[PDB]
Structures are given as C-alpha cells and as structure tokens.
Amino acid sequence: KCEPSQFQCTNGRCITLLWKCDGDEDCVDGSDEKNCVKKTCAESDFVCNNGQCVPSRWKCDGDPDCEDGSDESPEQCHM
Amino acid sequence: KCEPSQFQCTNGRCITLLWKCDGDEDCVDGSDEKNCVKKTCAESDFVCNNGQCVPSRWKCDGDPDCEDGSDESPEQCHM
Amino acid sequence: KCEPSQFQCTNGRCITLLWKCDGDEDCVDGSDEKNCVKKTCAESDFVCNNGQCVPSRWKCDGDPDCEDGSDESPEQCHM
Amino acid sequence: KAGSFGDLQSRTSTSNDLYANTNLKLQRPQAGIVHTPFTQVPSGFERWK
Amino acid sequence: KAGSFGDLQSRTSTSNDLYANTNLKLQRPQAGIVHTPFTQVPSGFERWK
Amino acid sequence: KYKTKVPSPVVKCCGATQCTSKPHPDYQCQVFSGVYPFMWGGAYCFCDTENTQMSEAYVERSEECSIDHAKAYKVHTGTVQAMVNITYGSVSWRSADV
Amino acid sequence: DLDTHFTQYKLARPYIADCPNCGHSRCDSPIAIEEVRGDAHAGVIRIQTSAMFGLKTDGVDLAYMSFMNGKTQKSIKIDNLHVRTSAPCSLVSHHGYYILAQCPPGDTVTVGFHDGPNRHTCTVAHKVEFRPVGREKYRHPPEHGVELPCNRYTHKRADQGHYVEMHQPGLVADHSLLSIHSAKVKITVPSGAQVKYYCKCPDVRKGITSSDHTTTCTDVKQCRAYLIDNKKWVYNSGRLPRGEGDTFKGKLHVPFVPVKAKCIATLAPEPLVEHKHRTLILHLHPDHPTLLTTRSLGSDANPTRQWIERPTTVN
Amino acid sequence: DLDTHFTQYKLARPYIADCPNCGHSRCDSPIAIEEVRGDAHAGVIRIQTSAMF
Amino acid sequence: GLKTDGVDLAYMSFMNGKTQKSIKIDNLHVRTSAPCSLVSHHGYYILAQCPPGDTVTVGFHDGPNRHTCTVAHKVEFRPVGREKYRHPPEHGVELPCNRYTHKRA
Ligand SMILES: [Ca+2]
Ligand SMILES: [Ca+2]
Ligand SMILES: [Ca+2]
Ligand SMILES: [Ca+2]
Ligand SMILES: [Ca+2]
Ligand SMILES: [Ca+2]
C-alpha cells in the first residue's frame, strides 16, 4: 500500500524501486532479490565457465582469478 | 550451632528450614536435597511412565507431553 | 647501527645487551634466542633425562617432579 | 501534586482502595506496531528520598 | 579567523573555488615509522553549533 | 566542516627532494631529513642517517556538507503581501492574496 | 546484483600500515584504522580500515573477508569481527574498506578479527559521542516519541556520487627473500615479482632483476630488497610510501554516504500549570535535561532560556 | 520440591513480541525486555522477558 | 607459566580442593570497564593495560567452570605533561614517565 514508484514484498512493507534485487534483502522475506533478469557482461572482460567476469589482463598470468580456474586451464591457454 | 528454626548442612553453614529439599543446592554438597520424601501427583493430573503429573486435558492430544511419550501411546489410548 | 653494548636483531631493531636470550623474543622474528650457549645445572639438584633439574629432596617421594617421569622410575628408584 | 509526596496514598498497607494521581497520559502508537505508549511524571517517593 | 565561523567558505555547494585557513602545520614523523602527522585548530562550524 | 586529506608521502632513500606550489586550499609541504623509516619486513633501505620524507597535506570540504551547512545571506527590504478573507451582503466568504 | 557494487573493488587489494596500540607496542597491523567518521545524529559511525570485507579471491561473498600477512593475500570467513568503543557495538554492514557500526559514546575505537589462534587488533584514539535530536538530551533512542528530521549514514552500498581514488603501490621491502646460497647472498623472486636490489658491500651495485641473480657479496645485512607488484592497486593512505613515476587516479565509491531521514526524539512529561494574577507557574518534572524557552508578544520579547535537569518551579 | 514451583509455568508458552533495537532496526524477537526492576540496594536487578528459562 | 613439571608460558596451575590442577591458558581475561589487553604473566603476577573504572576482575575458564573474582579498586588514567588527554596519541612530544617493566627479571 504505497506509491507505484515504490515496491512492496510479500510481508507488506513498502520499499523504493532502487532496492529491487540490488543484493541486499531489505524486507524480511527477501522476495525483492528473487525475480529479475541477469545483466550482460562487458566485451572487454574475459568470461569464465561459470560466468565470473575477470579482466583480460588477468588471463594467463600464473595465478587463479576464478572459482572454476578456467582462466588458467591448459585448454584456454596454450603451454 | 544455630537456632532450631535453622538447618545446618555437613560443612558447618546454617540455612533456614524453608530451604530443605526445595530444589536448589544451597551449600556446597547440597545435603538438604539428599534426604527428603517425594509427594504424590494431584487427582486431576495424569501420571506418565516416569511419574510426571500432566493434566487430563493434554491426554491423547496428538503431541508429546510426557517424558517417555506415554501420553500418546496406543496401549493407553484405545485406537 | 647502534652501540656494540646494544644487541641488533637481524630485522634492524637494536635492543640492550641485558636482554641477551633471556627467554622473551624481543625482536620480531626472534633471532635473539637462537644463538647462545646453554647454562650449567646446579650441583645440588638431580639432573633429569630431559635436562631439567629437580631438588634431590624431591627424589623418590612418590610424586612425579619430572616431565618424562625419570624421577619415579623403578630403574632409578630401588624399592 | 503527582510528583512530591502524595502521588500514591493507601489507607493501610493492604487496603483495596488507593488514591493515585500521576499525570498518566496515553500516546498514539507509531508506524503500525502493537504497543501501548504512555507518558507520566516520575514518582514523588523517589524525589522525596 | 580560522576558528569561529569563516574557516571554510565556498560560494556554492557544487562550486570549485574554496577559501580555507585552518592553521595547518605539518609535524616531523618520529621513531622511524611511515606516517604523516599534522596539527590544526578545530572547525569553527562545529564550534558555532 | 572541513576534511583534511593527506596523500602518500615520498621517501627518498639517500638524496634530496623538493616540492612545487600546487593550487590547493591550505596547501602545506615540508621536507624532513634523516628519518630512517622501519616498515614491515625490515628497514626500508640502506642509506643511513640522511633521507627525505615529504609528507604534504591539504584541506577540502567534507561529504556531509551536502546535507547540513550554514547559508550566508545579505538582506534588503522587499515586498509585503497578505491573504484576506472577505464577505459582504449576502455573498459568502471568498479569499485571495493581495 | 553484487557485481555492480563490487566492480572496482575487485581490482584493489588490502595492505599493511602502521597502527598505534595494535597490541601493546604499536606493531604493523593487517587492519589499520584510518579516518573514523562519527558526526551523525544516532551514534552510528563509519570506520575505514586497511583490510577488505565482503571479498574473496575466487569470488564476491558477504561472509568472507580478505587480508594480507607477509606478501600473500589470505581469505578467511568472518567469524568474530567486533567493534567496541566502551561496550561492544553492533555493526550494521561492511563493504570493501569500510565498516558501519552503532557505537555507545567513549574515547577509543577498536576493531579485531580472528582466523585461527591470532588476535589482530588495532586501537586508535578518537572521541565519539551520542548526538541527540531536538531539545532533550537523551542517551539512547527511545521506544516512542516524536519524529524529527535527522541525518544518518545509510546502510546501502550504492554509488551516490561520492568517490575516493586508488593508486599504484610503492616499493615494498621484504627481507625474507634474501638468503645465502653457499657463501654468497641469493635473491629469490616469486612468479615474476621483479625484485629490486641495492648492495654497498664494497660499492654500489643497484639494479633491477627478474630471475635468480645470485649477488656476489658476503653478508645479508649489507643489501636491501624491494618488490614491484602491479597486479592490484591500493588506496593512497598517509602510512604508505608513494610510487616513483606519475600515478593514475582510480575511482572507488564511498558506500555509506550520509543521507537525511527521520529520527525519534523523547517527549517531556506535561507540566502542571497554576494561574495567579498576571503570573504563570509551571511545575516541571523532567527525567532528561530539557530546554524551556519563553518570550513575550509585545514590543520587547525579553527572552529566557534555561536547561532544566532537576524538578524546579518557574514563575 | 522442584516440581512445586513449576506447577503453573508448565501450562504457559513463550511468545514473540516487538522490541526496539534488536540489531539496527527494531525487529520482532522471541526475547523482549519488559519491566526492568532496579529498586535494589546492591545494584542487583530483575528482568522479565518473553522467553522461558 | 608453571605446569607442575617444568616451564611453559602457555600453561597455568591452580588448586581445586587439595589437588594441584594444571591446564592450558585458553581465555584469561582482565576487565575494569572494558576488556583490557594483557601484556605478560609470571608466577603470581599479571600485567595488563586497563581503562579507568572502579573494579578489577579476572577469570579463567578451566572446563565448563567460570572461576571469576572481583575486587573494588579505583584505577585512574594518569596523563603526563600539561594536557589532560584520555588515551595516548599516535604522535606528539616524548616526555619522561614511569611505567612497569615489560620484561621479567
Ligand atoms: Ca533488494
Ligand atoms: Ca590468471
Ligand atoms: Ca535447597
Ligand atoms: Ca499429550
Ligand atoms: Ca630476549
Ligand atoms: Ca619425585
């Protein structure tokens, strides 16, 4: 029960539209972090197998920069 | 070495007579909680297997109420 | 960098010479305690197998006063 | 006077009747929560003490 | 006067020209550690409030 | 309220360093000689008893200035206006500012 | 998403700076307190440290923090992270370099976190205080009262137009990578770290290497070492040496910027009024220090102003 | 005896009621402090809550 | 520092009844109004840096036991010089003072 420029979750508390799946569960049930689309990654970054974007400078440097380690695999870097 | 209205445990300290077998260890060894009789259940309470007094309204209520779970047994409640 | 009457730990800190390997790691990496010769034991004390010294009076008293139990061993005590 | 000496007078130590004026006033609950807020002057027995 | 009201004056909240005299004096770092100490008088805005 | 910002000081190990006059509100610059700093993992360098630490500093307005601040105004005498409520005869009340 | 807020913070790394009263003897702490901000209206403060919160090498996570021991960045789960001033404060949020907390008044600010049996404490002197809203000087936000305009640090980690800059780190001196091989000192460089050296054993032999470079002199005491790491940037503190060349400016956003919201103030008990010929008598019975200001509606106001702490009567 | 003093508390249950300053923003908690009584002479106090001990 | 067998600085010894127990120092805490930071301990003596207050307490967890004691003793902060500060600063002017020794001798 608020302005259409405000958002209400399943508890009933009204929050602003800028808190829509921003990462913080503002209300109790946390339904604001549920239903939104995933943004696209940048072209200048390197895409991991799980989708964790890392800069292209960090590729093939001899140090793990990803959870899956696809930035240092021998398939993705010829050795 | 105190008044007859007081009770003395084995260490030497003297406590009052109301503190005999009331539940809590008052002096070091708790000698007042060692030699005391046990009272009966009430007439309006149901006695479980371990001897706890629970009211007859809670009998066969579908939820565990006694220590042994005898309040919901099929032997004591005819199903 | 300091006086020869002051001890310089290998990090660069200078401490006094009374603090020469007295037990406490006074510098950061603890290079003070590493290089100094071991002190002699008392002639009136019983020397344990681990280098400890316990009073003779305490030998064969029925109480283990040594770390390894060499003060109450049947090889060291004739009953 | 609700804050000096006679804000709570009882005829005996266990009397049922009790006189009490303390400027007790109810306050509105705020922002949709369930509580009863009030506002009153402090005790005269503590202020006399 | 660096301590009363006009120790930091700006024409607009989004302006780019600032006047501020706060008696800022640098002090020597001591005992061979890497830090920059200074001393200055307290703000006049917090003193005026 | 102000906020003073200190940049990272430069450390010349054995030599001399000087600074210019940068345009900044309440800019301060100095040179301290012979410091021999001690960072983590040993001393910084080897050149004993003569060094140089700059340690400049300058002031700026704070991030709380956009929320609470004092506005300075110079006044000059201007207009006076009022709102009147009037009625006459059998005509009801009507209001307009004058 | 989390990646929007943690975009430029992933490029940064923690550092080790000087902390006074870290233990008892002002060591170099992995977490170093810089620039405590404590000028809100509810006793809520914002602390900037040298560690990193809500960040792990593998990925972002709100239950993992990153810090540095020696030259290796370590990641440990946040288990007991505490802020205390004189009583243990209840921290609100953490994002990168910054911690938000709600502290009681006092004269010191303390932070600490454990990983194993370590302590890792830093204490920096700073006088924080409780600033009430309105004309009553309460010492804790009440259950009920009157709403008043107040400014407080928000717990949202958005941009909001405020930025800080990050810089390339300066040379870091490590004495653990110099050792004697057989009778001459040897330099161990890990993974292209480009160790700088400076020997003055008979004379100056300065230079930059990248692999091996067994130095041809005797003692480890008469030679220094450095390390240029350029993979991750750091915030330019006043406790770190600057770089040699011209250093670029980064743009790291300050998460918990001050905003203006609403605050709850206490309501004083009602006075008892007694009327006399041209005389108003007020019997005030307050529990906190309360302000009473009067004026007259004539040609001269004749204003009075006094703080009432004890139960007084004013004519 | 210990069962004598619990002959009426057995029939009761804890409840969840609101309280100010849980963490930062005044939740509804099983613990809810009501009627702190501190009219003692040694600094001792008695606290009534909503939980059951 | 004593464990009834030798010298170990991570161990303490106390008495319950007439048996000399000896455990490892897990959480030895001294607090006055805030939890103080310990410096050293040797035999009967503890050294700690405490805020001002009116009480001095110290306890140690043996097993599930708590084992705390408290004494009323007024301890004050004593600044050195002509300014009355409430905590020693990061930077300033070095002046002679008198404090207890860091070392055991
Ligand atoms: Ca959200
Ligand atoms: Ca990589
Ligand atoms: Ca008893
Ligand atoms: Ca039942
Ligand atoms: Ca030593
Ligand atoms: Ca023996």
Swiss-Prot record, chains A, B, C:
Changing residue 65 to A: Complete loss of entry of Semliki virus into the cell. It is found in: Cell membrane; Membrane, Clathrin-coated pit. Glycosylated. Changing residue 58 to F/R: Complete loss of entry of Semliki virus into the cell. Abundant in heart and skeletal muscle; also ovary and kidney; not in liver. Residues 1-38, 39-79 form the LDL-receptor class A domain. Disulfide bonds join 2-14, 9-27, 21-36, 41-53, 48-66, 60-77. Homooligomer. Binds to the extracellular matrix protein Reelin/RELN. Interacts with LRP8. Interacts with LDLRAP1. Interacts with SNX17. Interacts with DAB1. Interacts with PCSK9. Interacts with PAFAH1B3 and PAFAH1B2, the catalytic complex of (PAF-AH (I)) heterotetrameric enzyme; these interactions may modulate the Reelin pathway. Interacts with STX5; this interaction mediates VLDLR translocation from the endoplasmic reticulum to the plasma membrane. Interacts with CLU. (Microbial infection) Interacts with protein VP1 of the minor-group human rhinoviruses (HRVs) through the second and third LDL-receptor class A domains. This is Very low-density lipoprotein receptor. It comes from Homo sapiens. The chain holds residues 32 to 110 of 873 of the full protein.
Swiss-Prot record, chains D, E:
N-glycosylated. It is found in: Virion membrane; Host cell membrane. It is a single-pass type I membrane protein. Class II viral fusion protein. Fusion activity is inactive as long as E1 is bound to E2 in mature virion. After virus attachment to target cell and endocytosis, acidification of the endosome would induce dissociation of E1/E2 heterodimer and concomitant trimerization of the E1 subunits. This E1 trimer is fusion active, and promotes release of viral nucleocapsid in cytoplasm after endosome and viral membrane fusion. Efficient fusion requires the presence of cholesterol and sphingolipid in the target membrane. The precursor of protein E3/E2 and E1 form a heterodimer shortly after synthesis. Processing of the precursor of protein E3/E2 into E2 and E3 results in a heterodimer of the spike glycoproteins E2 and E1. Spike at virion surface are constituted of three E2-E1 heterodimers. After target cell attachment and endocytosis, E1 change conformation to form homotrimers. Interacts with 6K protein. This is Spike glycoprotein E1. The lineage of its organism: Viruses, Riboviria, Orthornavirae, Kitrinoviricota, Alsuviricetes. The chain holds residues 998 to 1046 of 1242 of the full protein.
Swiss-Prot record, chain F:
Disulfide bonds join 13-45, 14-47, 19-29. It comes from the Viruses. It is a single-pass type I membrane protein. Glycans are attached at residue 85. It is found in: Virion membrane; Host cell membrane. N-glycosylated. Residues 35-52 are annotated as: E1 fusion peptide loop. Coiled coil: none annotated. Class II viral fusion protein. Fusion activity is inactive as long as E1 is bound to E2 in mature virion. After virus attachment to target cell and endocytosis, acidification of the endosome would induce dissociation of E1/E2 heterodimer and concomitant trimerization of the E1 subunits. This E1 trimer is fusion active, and promotes release of viral nucleocapsid in cytoplasm after endosome and viral membrane fusion. Efficient fusion requires the presence of cholesterol and sphingolipid in the target membrane. The precursor of protein E3/E2 and E1 form a heterodimer shortly after synthesis. Processing of the precursor of protein E3/E2 into E2 and E3 results in a heterodimer of the spike glycoproteins E2 and E1. Spike at virion surface are constituted of three E2-E1 heterodimers. After target cell attachment and endocytosis, E1 change conformation to form homotrimers. Interacts with 6K protein. This is Spike glycoprotein E1.
Swiss-Prot record, chain G:
Coiled coil: none annotated. Residues 1-315 are extracellular. Palmitoylated via thioester bonds. These palmitoylations may induce disruption of the C-terminus transmembrane. This would result in the reorientation of E2 C-terminus from lumenal to cytoplasmic side. N-glycosylated. It is a single-pass type I membrane protein. It is found in: Virion membrane; Host cell membrane. Processing of the precursor of protein E3/E2 into E2 and E3 results in a heterodimer of the spike glycoproteins E2 and E1. Spike at virion surface are constituted of three E2-E1 heterodimers. Interacts with 6K protein. Plays a role in viral attachment to target host cell, by binding to the cell receptor. Synthesized as a p62 precursor which is processed by furin at the cell membrane just before virion budding, giving rise to E2-E1 heterodimer. The p62-E1 heterodimer is stable, whereas E2-E1 is unstable and dissociate at low pH. p62 is processed at the last step, presumably to avoid E1 fusion activation before its final export to cell surface. This is Spike glycoprotein E2. The lineage of its organism: Viruses, Riboviria, Orthornavirae, Kitrinoviricota, Alsuviricetes.
